[model samples]
Target: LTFCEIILMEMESHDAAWPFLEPVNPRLVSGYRRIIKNPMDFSTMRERLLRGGYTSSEEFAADALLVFDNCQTFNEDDSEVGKAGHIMRRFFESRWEEFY
Candidate 1:
């Protein structure tokens, strides 16, 4: 799969794994929710990144790290966001071999 395809898949997975957080981070989760709701942004981001001298794999890794880092802002691993962070870490780590 292309870099964008992989990132998009991760985004979908995150959306599907939405947690029932009693107190959620709207600032962070909302961004992810928007991406999940409107996937076209992924394609647009891909295009912009490619134009800005980034490869697909690079973008995928970057995005995975972004998700992982963003999700951990609240530091609650027992919640849904934590689950999403784990998924993003897997997503980020799994693709390293393709580049290195």
Candidate 2:
């Protein structure tokens, strides 16, 4: 529990993490709701972890990586959001290996 929490905190504080800190607004992004069937964000992930919602590390990592996956699916590679997603995804993966 603490291990995931520590990594979550580190990611929440990252510069590239801002874009993934909250839910994406369908109002702003056209077709976002239709496109992203499984939307993810740090707030929801942290809340779920706190309530023991993640049955295992696999489940937790899945949700964590899902945020980046959604980013890649929705945004262009050269766009701001896309770049941040790539940056944060690498950082999160590194932390996943480093702290374990």
Candidate 3:
């Protein structure tokens, strides 16, 4: 649906989305494995979306929010990734007002 597509595009096009665009490699951040139980990213989210993977509005929001939640868990609040995560997450919640 255009509704879903638009939300995805809005989230993906954000500059704050840079860190969450793709899956983070455990090789780079080795400790991320244990810390981040659910590793969600925009690329994977997009893939699932087109594959008929999304359920309710809540499901899509869950996966989208997970990316930010995981980021906060892994990085410091002052860290680059963490800061971006905060900004992006706020954007998502506001954008979510339509379906919510």
Candidate 4:
């Protein structure tokens, strides 16, 4: 998608969360279950996530990006998905101080 298309879709995602909500591929869904739920023993969490609730990639990215972009707001126990993202962002920040 073009940048403009991506931005517009992202804006819509703020409302719908999943503008691209087609029937999820069974293969993909099964894979997601296997990878995300089984090892973590978080079947409920996995189920909730797989229950077709995601709005947009941007919203997802924003939340994932937030814990790093604003570490002060991140709670360790509550922010597992974004923890690695935060650390990676921090690494980039430290390495490219002038870019920010």
Candidate 5:
């Protein structure tokens, strides 16, 4: 799959893991949601990934995760933010092994 496809699928799966009744802090949720929405456009991601000289999917995935990681805010006391960041990071990292 293309890097864009991987990103969309990963975001969808990540969001699905949270139950509808879950009370999510908007600060944490909004950060992630923003990436999936417009801030991290697929075309832009692909362009930046390639521009960075990442020739393999593994490299692209790692860099992709870096982009989101940089966009998030980490809190020592907020587990929700920590958890979301961790899962999203893990998701992209794991993709490297599968698609590289």
Candidate 6:
């Protein structure tokens, strides 16, 4: 399957999950700090919206960021690199700039 399809499938499998073009909070990562100081950041999230490929809404943007936060928290909590903050920051950089 293509990357987009894979993302869609994964998103659909979990009702709460959204197609995150950005990063999210870390604490939602599960049993971890929310890390508001530095959540996930994405640069092209707004660009995607402008491209008119995905339905862009403040609601979807919010949900995508949230789900990504949960995914990162669930996926990466402990690692030698200690870049959890960076991963989480990805979800924010894009939307934060455009939305707010």
Top-TM-score structure, candidate number: 2
lDDT of 1 by residue, 1-100 (tens): 3555565555545543343212244575555544332222234444555566455466555654554565565447777658766765675466555546
lDDT of each: 0.50, 0.91, 0.88, 0.35, 0.49, 0.42
Q: What is the lDDT of candidate 6?
A: 0.42
Which segments of model 3 are wrong by more than 4 Å? none
How many clashes does the backbone of model 6 have?
20
| Model 5 per-residue lDDT tens digits across residues 53-97 | 556556555545644444353333246645555665566568655
Cα misplacement distance, residue 2 of candidate 1 (Å): 2.9
Alpha-carbon shift of residue 84 in model 2 (angstroms): 0.5
lDDT of 2 by residue, 1-100 (tens): 6778888998999988889999999998899999999999999998898888999777889999999999999998899999999999999899898866
Q: Over the stretch 14-77, how does candidate 6's per-residue lDDT look in tens digits?
A: 3332324345434445444544333433334344434555644454455446545544554544
* Candidate 1 TM-score to native: 0.46
Q: After superposition on all CA atoms, what RMSD does each candidate show versus the true structure?
A: 7.6, 1.0, 1.2, 13.2, 7.9, 11.0
Off by over 4 Å in 1: 4-7, 10-56
Clashing pairs in 4: 17-54, 17-55, 17-56, 18-55
Ranking by TM-score: 2, 3, 1, 5, 6, 4
lDDT of 5 at 79: 63
Return the top candidate by lDDT: 2
> Model 4, clash count?
4
Q: List the residue pairs that clash in candidate 3.
A: none
Segments of candidate 5 deviating more than 4 angstroms: 1-3, 16-63, 71-73
Q: Which sections of candidate 4 miss by over 4 Å?
A: 1-48, 72-86, 90-100
What's the true lDDT of residue 32 in model 2? 97
Per-residue CA lDDT of model 3 for 1-100, tens digit only, reads 5667788898899989999999999999879988988899999999999998987677888898888889988999999999999999888888788565
lDDT of 2 at 18: 85
Cα lDDT for residue 33, model 5? 49
